[PDB]
Symmetry: T
Subunit: 141 residues, 12 copies
Amino acid sequence: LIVNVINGPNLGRLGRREPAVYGGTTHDELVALIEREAAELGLKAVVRQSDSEAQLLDWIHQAADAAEPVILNAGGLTHTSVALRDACAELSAPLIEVHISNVHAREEFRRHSYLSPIATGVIVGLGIQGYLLALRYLAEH
Amino acid sequence: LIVNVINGPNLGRLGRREYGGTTHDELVALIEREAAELGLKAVVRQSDSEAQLLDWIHQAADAAEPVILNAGGLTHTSVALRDACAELSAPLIEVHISNVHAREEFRRHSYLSPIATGVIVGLGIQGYLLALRYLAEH
Amino acid sequence: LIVNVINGPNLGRLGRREPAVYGGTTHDELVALIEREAAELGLKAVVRQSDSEAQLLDWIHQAADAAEPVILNAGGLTHTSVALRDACAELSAPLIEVHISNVHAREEFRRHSYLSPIATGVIVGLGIQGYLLALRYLAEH
Amino acid sequence: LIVNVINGPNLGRLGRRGGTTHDELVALIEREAAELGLKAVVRQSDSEAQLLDWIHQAADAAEPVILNAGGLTHTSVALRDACAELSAPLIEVHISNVHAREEFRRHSYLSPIATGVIVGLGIQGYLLALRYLAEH
Amino acid sequence: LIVNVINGPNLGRLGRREPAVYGGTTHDELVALIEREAAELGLKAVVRQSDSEAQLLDWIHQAADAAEPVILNAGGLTHTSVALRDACAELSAPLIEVHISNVHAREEFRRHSYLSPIATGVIVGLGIQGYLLALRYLAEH
Amino acid sequence: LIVNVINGPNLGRLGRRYGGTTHDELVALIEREAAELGLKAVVRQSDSEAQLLDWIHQAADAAEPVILNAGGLTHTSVALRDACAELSAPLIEVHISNVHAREEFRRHSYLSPIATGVIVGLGIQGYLLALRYLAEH
Amino acid sequence: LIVNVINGPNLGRLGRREPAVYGGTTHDELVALIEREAAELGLKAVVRQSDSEAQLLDWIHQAADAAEPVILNAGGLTHTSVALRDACAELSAPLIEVHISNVHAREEFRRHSYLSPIATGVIVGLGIQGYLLALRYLAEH
Amino acid sequence: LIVNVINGPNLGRLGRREPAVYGGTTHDELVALIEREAAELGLKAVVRQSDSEAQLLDWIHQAADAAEPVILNAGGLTHTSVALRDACAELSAPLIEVHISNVHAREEFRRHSYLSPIATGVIVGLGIQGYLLALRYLAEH
Amino acid sequence: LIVNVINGPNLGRLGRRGGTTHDELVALIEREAAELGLKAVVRQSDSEAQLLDWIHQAADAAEPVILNAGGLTHTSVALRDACAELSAPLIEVHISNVHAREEFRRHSYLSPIATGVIVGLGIQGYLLALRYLAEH
Amino acid sequence: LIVNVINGPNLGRLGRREPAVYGGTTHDELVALIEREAAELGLKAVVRQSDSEAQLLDWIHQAADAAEPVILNAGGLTHTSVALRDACAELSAPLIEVHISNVHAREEFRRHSYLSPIATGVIVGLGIQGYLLALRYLAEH
Amino acid sequence: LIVNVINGPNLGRLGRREYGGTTHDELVALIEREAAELGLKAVVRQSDSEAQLLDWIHQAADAAEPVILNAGGLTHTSVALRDACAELSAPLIEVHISNVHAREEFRRHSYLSPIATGVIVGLGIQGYLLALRYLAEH
Amino acid sequence: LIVNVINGPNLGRLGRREPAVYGGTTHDELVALIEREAAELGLKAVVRQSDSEAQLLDWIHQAADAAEPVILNAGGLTHTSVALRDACAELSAPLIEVHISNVHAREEFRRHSYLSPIATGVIVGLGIQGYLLALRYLAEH
Ligand SMILES: O=C(O)c1cc(NCc2cccc([N+](=O)[O-])c2)cc(C(=O)O)c1
Ligand SMILES: O=C(O)c1cc(NCc2cccc([N+](=O)[O-])c2)cc(C(=O)O)c1
Ligand SMILES: O=C(O)c1cc(NCc2cccc([N+](=O)[O-])c2)cc(C(=O)O)c1
Ligand SMILES: O=C(O)c1cc(NCc2cccc([N+](=O)[O-])c2)cc(C(=O)O)c1
Ligand SMILES: O=C(O)c1cc(NCc2cccc([N+](=O)[O-])c2)cc(C(=O)O)c1
Ligand SMILES: O=C(O)c1cc(NCc2cccc([N+](=O)[O-])c2)cc(C(=O)O)c1
Ligand SMILES: O=C(O)c1cc(NCc2cccc([N+](=O)[O-])c2)cc(C(=O)O)c1
Ligand SMILES: O=C(O)c1cc(NCc2cccc([N+](=O)[O-])c2)cc(C(=O)O)c1
Ligand SMILES: O=C(O)c1cc(NCc2cccc([N+](=O)[O-])c2)cc(C(=O)O)c1
Ligand SMILES: O=C(O)c1cc(NCc2cccc([N+](=O)[O-])c2)cc(C(=O)O)c1
């Protein structure tokens, strides 16, 4: 089973920026770390990142079409794109929203999510380890 | 390293009446075994009483011990619980079995989330094990 | 047929005082007034009062295991206790919420109820006799 | 003592998508009324104007009112006003549990100036309203 | 110049109630007072009351058709009817909203009028005298 | 295959200050189209909530569809909504003007959540297009 | 009987420009008309204007101590000043709020008044004549 | 006469995803169906779809300079995009906002729109036929 | 001549991560109240039901109350109703300035029914409130 | 050590209207009491009152320059004057807000204060003693 | 060519700030020199008195003189100000020294902004100099 | 010394329609004035426009990485885009927001900006000159 991990706006600048907020692991490094861990779990992971909403929707259609699960961290889109939420609503396989930071201890507007109500589950504020714990849930279903 | 798992009211009624599946005494064994398997000691206690929860959260404060907590309904009502928890130096992880952001609008706000290290929602009984794992690393 | 009447915080000092917004009847004379009406319609009503939210929950628990119906007047907790709502959600058997005073005349915080949406029905502002009226609903189903 | 039972718009439709038509409820009420020594005058209208005149008449004659106003329960100040004048008890009644439903059904204009409220106890709620009046 | 005085629902009950609100004058006397003042001011006045919205809507249509000013006290309808407002918005002549009591000192729900924004002017809380001040406004324009 | 077209408060006043064209021209226009489509259309207009509620009850009992333009009652009357909810056949809300370009209070509608669909701002043809949707159900 | 007419900030600017929002009558001409009208009514009108809040407080204080009625158009202070409210609260004689323009046909902030809920009545939109009308209310006490 | 029919994010999935509403007609077919209807009415219907907000913006820019009509189903963007609204306001030919499903009967955030207050009119909940319906309006006016 | 000083949830934790412990607090309050002609009973509980019992006893005994209900200030309708019953003065004290804090701390169920409130003046609040009671 | 007791609008009229609510103590009796109290404690109280916002500003500016502590009862301006807050935030010394009446048992608009969030503390509802209690806090720091 | 620079409450206190480091006296001299460098005359006044502010605004209205106004807190609280300012027929520029959008919620609404020609915020005392430069060109 | 001037969606069509709300000067003419002016200050301006949020985020990343200041008119995204705010938050050099029109004289949705609270400052309503007055600030530091 393939499992898509999809990262949204600004997330390709992970590690080089905001290390005190998002940890020091880079995104090139995130991919490898997650690839390694899906393998160990008997899963295969496609980890991708984009600053373009249109790209994100395309990858979401692709997963919806393959019946593939999806670990999504939309960055700021989470609280703004109806378009995104509509795309993830097609997903037969489970959907796990992840955010490295604790969205709830942060600005007011980061506390409302157009995606949370249609997701299997959500993990927030557990750093980069939030992706791996998401794989783990999927590997068990 | 001792890890505190705390379950708020009505959580003694787990399993009985439908999600999963698992009962409370069962959940105790899953977590307890998983924890040791990770090299951790876990006490798991449930309570229908705010004062009992506050007491456990005080004892864990004094003891600098990490806390994992499904406070339940009190998540959305209790300022006392929130202030009890703010004292914690060790990580605190909020766990909810169901996906609360897909429920009534009043479970969509949590007094605990903004003072918590992290939050895990909608992943079932597995949530606890995942919190246990995060703690094993930090 | 075993009907449960539960009374939450502050109702213990009924009659006693204040007696003008709730009326003359004591808590003990309430038990007895119900206990008799319980007979007059053929059921065996259990009446209990506690200021402790936890006792109440324990009692709602029992009634759920027993599949026994519930008449509930949970003082102020009505408006602030999700856990009390949650425990009441479990009732196979009917739940009648009763408030002695017309809570819709009183302060605004008193005009929303967490219990109201998961209850079979609500009786409000018919005084002490409202408990009795709801005993009669249970007789008829 | 003549208790008035007034029923609002759409309530003549009773029994359609309790198969109790309006006409049947009038008989279940009138029985219980006298099975308690009271005269119950049960009426229905789709006209706000009409209901307002009915409440006028009860106002002018110190008679108790049991009111299920339907929609107008949430919309009508003119109805709130008229029911304010009732010196005798007013008991607002609704067959379904309005709190289990849409948010707009959760506010009532009537509830605050009413003596008491019965909700979602089906049709026996009208009857219970009477038993209360039975005690005055 | 014919001027229209229209009164909404419950306004036939002037005399009752409260005598505290409201005041002493019955609808009849008010009707008689208005006609007296209107002649005295050199205008003909037609005072009608109804508890019926459609009835009030027709009285307004005719005033639109005839280019007659209206002095309007709609009772509750002030705060609830788009129909009435829509209808009054067709009046080419002046429209003066009048209320007997001080609606800004009463229930929050009375502090909003659908008519106020499309009226020429508004007089409130000045009792029965209000109609006669409205009258005077109309006579000078 | 009958379609009820019901207009609400004020729409009697059409053509004398929606668009031009009178109410009488409207009924005429709606019939010719309904016939052009193998439908019979009964177009009535009241100012009374009572009169409307009643027509809705009749369409309910007869399982006829309704094109409704309730005027201001769209935004005020829960009564009108409950009667409309009874309908088993389609219900199509229509407005002549664009209710979303006007005052705020006109931008929420008690009917829309329980209607099949809504047509706003396309003037009088708004009714015509609605019948045509009913033609293909 | 002494009657006090008090105009708040900007109302010294009356007549000049001249707005079609307010009349072409200057604030001087307004004084003349009121005192004149009051004389015809057998009242004695003192008409004063200020841009200073504190000065309006002093005049209200002075009206309170002499138990004289007040016709008030506080301009915009209506909407912002609690201090004016508290000072007007202590009047025993009537207080009639007057605005030249219809303030419900205007912007949102002009549609709440700190004063309305404590005034005897309010006249809004009838132009300069509103002051004369309020005089008539007062002449008839 | 050229009419532009513009479909927003996720409308490429038309037919493949949840059919209760939006139906079982794919996007390809709709273009055929729209194209045929235009022939019948003596119109040329250009039908296009993009997940790219910038691609939509460009198409709407073009429709403006050409003064061509626009039928627009912007999907989610309806509720989240100001850029879209602004470009649309900029059109001089009519703009019919079309939505396949009854937006007003779903989640509250689908109940407010950016485009509607600047649209000629709006069609909702009439399925794929809305688009045919909007064409008819355009054919006559 | 008795004053009740009742302390809510978490306040048993004082001086531990403010400085002054709860045992110091009682010490301070008792002496100062003695210095004023009063006798002060200073109780503290994390349990809502116990606070109710302490407020009940005081309503019965017509003794004044000083109350730092902790978080219970913003959640407990029960507690408030219990305090509504008090006939002698009810003074609300918070050690910190609850208005410079989170939004939910800027609203109290209690304040609207207390004689008055003292906020943000640390431990001296209690003593200050004892001094309002000496004078009445 | 000098303490600034500043009283806002209407407070000059203490001891006159509204003996219930504000007490029987006059402002002159207040200025005296506070002065005697200061002596007993080792402080020198400077008590001033004004209905003028510009004046209170002046006074707070002066306290700021002298790094003197301020006890302020701002009257209405508590709820309205951002300019007041601004001047107060400049104080190095403690700032204790005082209200004679329990503002939290009165109109909602008094329930919220611009100053409270930047005050050392607030004492409300204890009548005139509240000024002496504030003094006494400043005597210990 | 006369330009009115009007400073509202608390602005007499610049330099004993918390808001730059320059004083009101000094700012008066900055502005005057720049205005003259720009072919203009700037009258710079500050008052803590709303009534005073209205007067100057009345005068500049009657003179059809443009206005640079930094109204302090009154920006958020005075309709009387809004009203006085609406009368001006020459441009009105609202200036603030500090970024108001980055502070309290109450600072994010203005009675003036809606009827100002334009607004300049966050750019320090320099905001006054640029405002002048716009009036210099139009 | 590089200064990035970056313009959002729709800004390409500057000059063309409008010339009322923001207009007259085309985007090219704009690029020329800014350049002519940036030089006279001893700066170099890079002026780019785009309809694409991704592209906009890309240019902010570049400025962010280069430590160059940014004058940004994001247009609509001012109000809608978290990701752009997060991208802007990483800049270490001043960020200045500019809008040609006065955004506070317009619709309510335009009266809130995600970037103002993280910008150095904002210039609004001075049209094109805003940009030139923004360079001028940068030249001073
Ligand atoms: O807006 C949000 O809720 C949000 C946005 C983002 N944006 C992505 C981002 C923002 C700033 C900087 C980076 N980065 O990785 O350099 C990445 C992340 C997160 C999170 O993972 O917790 C949450
Ligand atoms: O309101 C909540 O946030 C909440 C409350 C609760 N309450 C405990 C509870 C309520 C109903 C039923 C059970 N149960 O386990 O049978 C347990 C649980 C959960 C959860 O982890 O899904 C979330
Ligand atoms: O929060 C409520 O709506 C509520 C609270 C209460 N509180 C219980 C209570 C409070 C104060 C005093 C008494 N009592 O028994 O004198 C009882 C009662 C009722 C009622 O039955 O109408 C309703
Ligand atoms: O809701 C209102 O704004 C309103 C309603 C009404 N309703 C008419 C009314 C209601 C109850 C009783 C009577 N009456 O005359 O006994 C009359 C009047 C007035 C008024 O003239 O101040 C204002
Ligand atoms: O409040 C509304 O949404 C509303 C009210 C109405 N009211 C009907 C109406 C009011 C005033 C005048 C007329 N007329 O035809 O002269 C008709 C119509 C429409 C519409 O179809 O756009 C919408
Ligand atoms: O804010 C208000 O409600 C308000 C303000 C004012 N402001 C006083 C004012 C503003 C602009 C111009 C003038 N004037 O007379 O030159 C006077 C007047 C009126 C009114 O009398 O209708 C209402
Ligand atoms: O609900 C509140 O705003 C509140 C809560 C509390 N909670 C009591 C508390 C919580 C955590 C720690 C302690 N403590 O022992 O220092 C005390 C205190 C205060 C106060 O006195 O300012 C105010
Ligand atoms: O608006 C307020 O919160 C407010 C206003 C005021 N206004 C002062 C005031 C109003 C009416 C009468 C008097 N007085 O001194 O006779 C004084 C006082 C108080 C208080 O000390 O509790 C509180
Ligand atoms: O309320 C505002 O938006 C506001 C208030 C003020 N108040 C003036 C002020 C308040 C406190 C302290 C000072 N000062 O001179 O140190 C000045 C200034 C400014 C500004 O120029 O950016 C903005
Ligand atoms: O919503 C805004 O804050 C906003 C949006 C926009 N949208 C950009 C835009 C919209 C329509 C037309 C054009 N144009 O240049 O033709 C440009 C501009 C401006 C401004 O520069 O004042 C401000």
